[PDB]
Amino acid sequence: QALKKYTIDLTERAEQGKLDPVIGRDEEIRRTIQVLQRRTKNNPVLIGEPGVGKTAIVEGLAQRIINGEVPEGLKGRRVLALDMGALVAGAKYRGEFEERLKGVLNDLAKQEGNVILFIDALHTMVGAGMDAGNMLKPALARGELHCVGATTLDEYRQYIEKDAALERRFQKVFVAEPSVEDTIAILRGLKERYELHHHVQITDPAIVAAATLSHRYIADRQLPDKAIDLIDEAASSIRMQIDSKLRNKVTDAEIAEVLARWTGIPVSRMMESEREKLLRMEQELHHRVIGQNEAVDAVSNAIRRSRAGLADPNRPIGSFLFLGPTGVGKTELCKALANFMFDSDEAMVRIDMSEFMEKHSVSRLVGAPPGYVGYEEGGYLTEAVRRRPYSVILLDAVEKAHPDVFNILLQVLDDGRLTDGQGRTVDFRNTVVIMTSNLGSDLIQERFGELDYAHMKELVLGVVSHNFRPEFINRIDEVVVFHPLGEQHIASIAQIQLKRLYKRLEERGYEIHISDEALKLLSENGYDPVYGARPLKRAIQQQIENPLAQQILSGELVPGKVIRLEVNEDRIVAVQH
């Protein structure tokens, strides 16, 4: 016979107990029993995006047939898993696959309607040699074959809904992804099975945490399989930490460590080390951003409102409109924010809006529509956020952008979603959009003297109201205003540049000190109201990197010696003492 060859018995395996005792799913199984008890077209196909457990539905049906919870037309059935891969094995000759398939069909006709077939990956049945649909297809029509498909919706619309007769043979039992409490019940049955597997124990707050956070963070896989993967690798981690040298109980700290190994996101709560960071988040950000207190207050309040569960699950973490003097640390607050937010000065997406001066540049930023040249790789913003969900976007110099781009940002800052050219949505609810401009720079550099921050923000917000449309400036979470710098802040910037210079040259091997008079000459040589601290940057770079490295590479200076940077009338001389 061929049923022993090519078909696997499920009801024997559910009778031995070698399957998942899946909990729930009763409405899909009731619809499958509706379809399997018809007269013609007895052919359900289970359509779901992967991971929703369609194999689990058919095996739960097999378990109900064994236990006897089925109507009086399914008692005694044998559910058989046909293998479409195991039939195209030796078919290298002519008419050899047809021998196997018709042997299977004659055996299933000889069984006299007591066998429910189950073709997992039903899209494989289309091409297996015309060829493989076109032998089953009258048996699927006349209802004598009680086939049960199990497919994915993308594969269904690609393979089967192009072939119309095979599409009308089957019946769609549309399977949705289960909820989080349903996933909890699933993981309770599997908690019994896993605690009998590893000889470990599992705690139910870890189960509800794993299911909820796996719905929250991993949007790539689907529930419940990603949750089961979390639970099982947590169990294996505990099982190896038993014999790597002491628990037997899995808690959600282990789930957080496993999920950090998966995706890297700060899933863990306050461990009283990053909480001391977050309570002094302002004092943290003043290690790199000296002064500019109001916006540091606002942005650290935005992150502290995000981490505390007070974050709105529709809007992003925060929109921001940076104004003020041109170029002081817009970029420095942004890069230090990316540093103390997730990693470093590299997990940001900078988009210079001065490039975006026409509408086809807006086509660049969103993406090309179908039937156009750059359709196949999408836009620039939305591809960047699909790469980097947990990031900070820096739209830089938004005043040079054509005002239509603010409509893209209307969508962005309304609901955290933006649809690119290829017809897909991007979630912005894990980003911090920050937009910089200079639409009040002369006014803020002039009338800052003894005018408070509130009325200054009011007046420059009126200016921006004359600039933009009211629709967009309603969407801004908080406009903040940078104030102009002072000379002690210039001294602080010079101290930070001397610290990184001493770090680089101590990694090189030198020990260099400086006089305070040289720092005063740098503060003289590095400021204007119209540019700010980039004159200080180029002044430090010219007056240090050019003469001192020339003195070092002249075979003159020795590593290890104290190199006191003495001053000159116009320059900086170095000594070996």
Ligand X SMILES: Nc1ncnc2c1ncn2[C@@H]1O[C@H](COP(=O)(O)OP(=O)(O)O)[C@@H](O)[C@H]1O
Ligand Y SMILES: Nc1ncnc2c1ncn2[C@@H]1O[C@H](COP(=O)(O)OP(=O)(O)OP(O)(O)=S)[C@@H](O)[C@H]1O
The pattern of x and - marking residues 453 through 492 that bind ligand X according to CB under 6 A reads: ----------------------------------------
The pattern of x and - marking residues 223 through 262 that bind ligand X according to CB under 6 A reads: -xx--x----------------------------------
Which partner in ligand Y, a second copy, ligand X, none is near 290 (CB below 5 to 8 A by kind)?
ligand X
Residue 211 touching ligand Y (CB under 6 A) = no
Which partner in a second copy, ligand X, ligand Y, none is near 263 (CB below 5 to 8 A by kind)?
a second copy
Helix (H, G, I), strand (E, B) or coil at 358: coil
Other CB atoms within a 10 A radius of the CB of residue 514 amount to 21
Helix (H, G, I), strand (E, B) or coil at 47: strand
Residue 535 touching ligand Y (CB under 6 A) = no
Residue 78 touching a second copy (CB under 8 A) = no
Which partner in ligand X, a second copy, ligand Y, none is near 493 (CB below 5 to 8 A by kind)?
ligand X
Helix (H, G, I), strand (E, B) or coil at 308: coil
Stretch of 142-150, 285-293, 336-344, 558-566 contacting a second copy, by CB under 8 A: 142-150
CA distances (Å), origin 18, targets 62, 65, 380, 437, 489: 12, 15, 49, 64, 71
**Among the listed residues 37, 337, 62, 56, the one whose alpha carbon sits nearest the alpha carbon of residue 222:** 56
Stretch of 65-73, 91-99, 222-230, 274-282 contacting ligand X, by CB under 6 A: 222-230
Residue 52 touching ligand Y (CB under 6 A) = yes
* Amino acid (one-letter) located at 428: F
Residue 149 touching ligand Y (CB under 6 A) = no
Name the β-bridge partners of 538: none
Binding residue for a second copy, selected from 130, 246, 450, 577, defined by CB under 8 A: 130
28: exposed, middle or buried (Cβ count in 10 Å: 0-12, 13-18, 19+): buried
Residue 565 touching ligand X (CB under 6 A) = no
**Among the listed residues 168, 83, 192, the one whose alpha carbon sits nearest the alpha carbon of residue 128:** 83
* Amino acid (one-letter) located at 393: I
Residue 263 touching a second copy (CB under 8 A) = yes
Which residues, 6 or more positions from 550, have their beta carbon under 8 angstroms from its beta carbon? none
Binding residue for ligand X, selected from 74, 290, 348, 519, defined by CB under 6 A: 290
Could you tell me the smallest distance in angstroms from the CB atom of residue 488 to a second copy? 26
Interaxial angle between packed helices 204-216 and 252-263, expressed in degrees from 0 to 180 and rounded to the nearest 10: 30
Could you tell me the smallest distance in angstroms from the CB atom of residue 126 to ligand X? 17
Stretch of 48-56, 136-144, 310-318, 513-521 contacting ligand X, by CB under 6 A: 48-56
Which pairing describes strands 115-120 and 149-151: parallel, antiparallel, or unpaired? parallel
Q: Is the peptide bond before 316 cis (omega within 30 degrees of 0)?
A: no
Residue 50 touching ligand X (CB under 6 A) = yes
Q: Is 44 annotated to bind ligand? A: no
> How far is 250 from 204, CA to CA, in rounded Å?
9
**Sign of the CA dihedral 69, 70, 71, 72?**
negative
> How far is 61 from 55, CA to CA, in rounded Å?
10
Query: Cβ distance 386 to 401 under 8 Å?
Result: no
Q: Is 526 annotated to bind ligand? A: no
Residue 41 touching a second copy (CB under 8 A) = yes
Residues numbered 264-303 forming contacts with a second copy, rule: CB under 8 A: none
Could you tell me the smallest distance in angstroms from the CB atom of residue 252 to ligand Y? 20
Binding residue for a second copy, selected from 27, 67, 89, 486, defined by CB under 8 A: 89
Which partner in a second copy, ligand X, ligand Y, none is near 403 (CB below 5 to 8 A by kind)?
a second copy
Nearer to a second copy, 21 or 143 (CB): 143
**Among the listed residues 214, 155, 149, 156, the one whose alpha carbon sits nearest the alpha carbon of residue 184:** 214
**Sign of the CA dihedral 470, 312, 267, 175?**
negative
Residues numbered 169-188 forming contacts with ligand Y, rule: CB under 6 A: 186
Q: Is 329 annotated to bind ligand? A: yes
Residue 429 touching a second copy (CB under 8 A) = yes
Residue 50 touching ligand Y (CB under 6 A) = yes
Residues numbered 225-254 forming contacts with ligand Y, rule: CB under 6 A: 225, 228
Which pairing describes strands 44-47 and 149-151: parallel, antiparallel, or unpaired? parallel
> How far is 449 from 75, CA to CA, in rounded Å?
89
**Sign of the CA dihedral 21, 35, 98, 153?**
negative
Q: Is 21 annotated to bind ligand? A: no
Nearer to ligand X, 222 or 382 (CB): 222
Q: Is 50 annotated to bind ligand? A: yes
Q: Is 40 annotated to bind ligand? A: no
**Among the listed residues 257, 392, 239, the one whose alpha carbon sits nearest the alpha carbon of residue 330:** 392
Which partner in ligand Y, a second copy, ligand X, none is near 311 (CB below 5 to 8 A by kind)?
a second copy
> How far is 514 from 565, CA to CA, in rounded Å?
4
Return left, alpha or beta for 536; rule: phi > 0 is left, psi -120 to 50 is alpha, else beta: alpha
Residue 133 touching ligand X (CB under 6 A) = no
- For 40, the token pair is 């013609």
> How far is 22 from 57, CA to CA, in rounded Å?
8
The pattern of x and - marking residues 507 through 536 that bind ligand X according to CB under 6 A reads: -------------------------xxx--
Stretch of 291-299, 414-422, 485-493, 564-572 contacting a second copy, by CB under 8 A: 414-422
Nearer to a second copy, 37 or 488 (CB): 37
Q: Is 48 annotated to bind ligand? A: yes
> How far is 497 from 526, CA to CA, in rounded Å?
13
Could you tell me the smallest distance in angstroms from the CB atom of residue 304 to ligand X? 21
Interaxial angle between packed helices 180-195 and 204-216, expressed in degrees from 0 to 180 and rounded to the nearest 10: 130
Which pairing describes strands 511-514 and 562-567: parallel, antiparallel, or unpaired? parallel
Binding residue for a second copy, selected from 23, 105, 141, 459, defined by CB under 8 A: 141
Q: Which residues are annotated as a binding site for ATP?
A: 48-55, 324-331
Q: Which residues are annotated as a binding site?
A: 48-55, 324-331
The site for ligand X (CB under 6 A) is made up of: 20, 22-24, 48, 50-56, 168, 186, 190, 224-225, 228, 289-292, 326-332, 436, 493, 496, 532-534, 537
The site for ligand Y (CB under 6 A) is made up of: 20, 22-25, 40, 50-56, 152, 164, 168, 186, 224-225, 228
